[PDB]
Each structure stands twice: as C-alpha cells, then as structure tokens.
Amino acid sequence: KEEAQETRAQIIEAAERAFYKRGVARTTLADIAELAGVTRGAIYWHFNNKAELVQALLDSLHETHDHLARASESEDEVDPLGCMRKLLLQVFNELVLDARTRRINEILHHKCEFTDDMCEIRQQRQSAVLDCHKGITLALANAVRRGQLPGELDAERAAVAMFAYVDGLIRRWLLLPDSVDLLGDVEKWVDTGLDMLRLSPALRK
C-alpha cells in the first residue's frame, strides 16, 4: 500500500509531461507536484531534488532491454552478435512504437540542458554513457572470442563508433522522423551499424 508506493510512479509520469512541455531547465518541483496532484513533500519523500527525477526517467529506459543486454555481455552466450542485433532492433522498435520511450528520449536529447546549476545532470549522463560503453565493449569481445567479428578488432574504438552511430541516428529520427523510415527499414539501419564493426578496416587496430 501505504502511504503510496505507486505515488512514486505517479510523480514520474507528471515529471515526463512537465519536462516534455517546459523542458528540464525551467521545471520546478512545484510544477511537477501540482501536475501530479500531490505536495512538494510527497515528491521529497521519493526524490531529494530534480536531478533524482531526471535520473529516474533515464534509468527507466534500460529495463525493457535488460535480458537482451546481459545476454550479449555474458561469456557463455553462443551467439553474442546475434543478441546485440536483437537488442538494437528492440531499441529502435521501442523508440518508434512506444510514446513513453520516445518522450523520455526527446527529453534527454532535446529538452535537458547541462548547466553549472545541476552538474549532477551532466555527471549522471557521463557515467550512464561510460556504463553503456563498458557493456558494449564486453559484447564486442564475446563476438570476437566466437569469430563473429574479425580477430584484432579494436573493441574500445568500435564500441564508440557503434554508440555514436546509434545515438546520432536516434537523435536524427527525433529531430526529423519523416526522413528516416526507422520502423519499416529497421533491418537496414541496424545492419548498417553492424556492418561497420566488421567490414571497416579503420576499426581494425
């Protein structure tokens, strides 16, 4: 029950609407609280500040891909590349179909400044990205151990090349959706990225 565990989910939903409408920079807890139907104190009970909320939205994105990620990263996975290809297809699908994922991504890329007032936001991002980076490198190592991608493949650099590509593609669809048939052509887009990892000599040390 009680007071309400699910109040925490109600506050997050309102934080999404507020951030999407006014942007993170100019949203205050008061705004969010009025929007949720609660008091600032009810927000303070779940979050110590605005950075914590942003954090929660960020963190929510990882859930849906949890299993597919852990799969690719694991040593005992027979088909590590196959899991990464699967995950990317999910990432792009969730992005195109789920208004929730779209909005949080929109907030993250286009509605969330990095300013000296909440270095917390930029810090959250940095570590979030280094994390994702570590994960990516691990997967690349596994695909190599299994000869799914060329032997002496500079993992670190390919990881960055991957993340960059995917990241910029997401941001591109966000800015101009009707100029990237992301849904229909998911296969191509994902593979374009994947092809780079194996066919590109520049990524080979």
Add this chain to the structure above:
Amino acid sequence: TKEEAQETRAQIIEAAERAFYKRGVARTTLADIAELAGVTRGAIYWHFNNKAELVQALLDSLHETHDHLARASESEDEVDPLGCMRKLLLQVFNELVLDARTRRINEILHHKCEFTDDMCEIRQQRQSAVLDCHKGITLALANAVRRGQLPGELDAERAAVAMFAYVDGLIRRWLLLPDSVDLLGDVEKWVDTGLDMLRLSPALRK
C-alpha cells in the same frame, strides 16, 4: 556599413556564446547579454529580434570555416569529391579540438539548448539546418559514386543519414566525454571509420 555597428554585432555574438554556455539558451534573456556585452538593450533588438535569431547566428558561424571544401565536394566538376569530403571532416574535427569558440558553440548546440513550444523557432531552424546539411552530403556522395570513388549501387540518401548520424554522435560523445575519444591523435581513423561504412556496408547499397 557603419563599422560602429559591425563591431557591436560581433560583440553581441561573442557575449551570447559566453552567456548561453554558462547559463544555457532556455533561462537567458536578451537583457542578460546587454549587460554582459556592455551595450544598450535596444541595440540588441536592432541587431536581433528574438533569442532564436541569435542562436541562428551562432549555428551559422560554424559553416564559414568549411564553406570552401563543402562547395568543392558538391561541385559536379570536382575531380576528387570523396577526397574533399574526407579533408572537410578532418577540418571539422581539428577545429572542434583546437578552436575553443567552435567547441563552445557546439556544446551550446548539443547540451545547452532545449526545444520547447515556447521557442519552436529553435527546433524549426535546427531541422532546416540538418536538412541543408543533408542535401549537401547527398550530392557529394552521389558525385563520389559517379566517379567510382564509392560502390555504384550505393543509396546516397540513407548513406548520408548514416554518416551524419555517425559524425553527429561522435562529436557529442567527445563533448560529453572528451578524455575518452582521442579525437586529436586518432583523427584520421575516426574520419575513415565513417567513410569505410559508406563504401563497404552492403546494407547501404541499392
């Protein structure tokens, strides 16, 4: 013409950069730049109507340093369009790593500028600019295909979107975590990796 005005504009723009960088585009009024640049408010209004007008000016300063190579790389009469495109991206990354002004505007563009219904002109311009850039990379690519620099069957369109995506994300990665990408030392590698995808990826063909 009056040199007095041309100097005041150059000062508004310099201060906008320093402002937007520290406080961000969202919570920064034009009045704030007036005090920062040491100029009358109405003067900024003479120079720039709304804040979006200024942001636009910052975005613009970026294309100056590359206009030459960009044009060359698009020209149908250009003998080595892929070489041009290569040299251009090299000249983009160098200026990023070396020129603090360029780094700051990109940081503003990527990390300090929100899209809100209040200021929709910022998003519209941002869309306009990327469509501009887009049309650019397509011509260039097509010209490199036409000259057997790339695979004949390449899809210029998608290929352009891919490359831009790759270039845009890398810049951002470096702004967020500079001490990760040795963009200065490995510069040629990063430029090549992107290009390799354009010519080697079978998913980009047809």
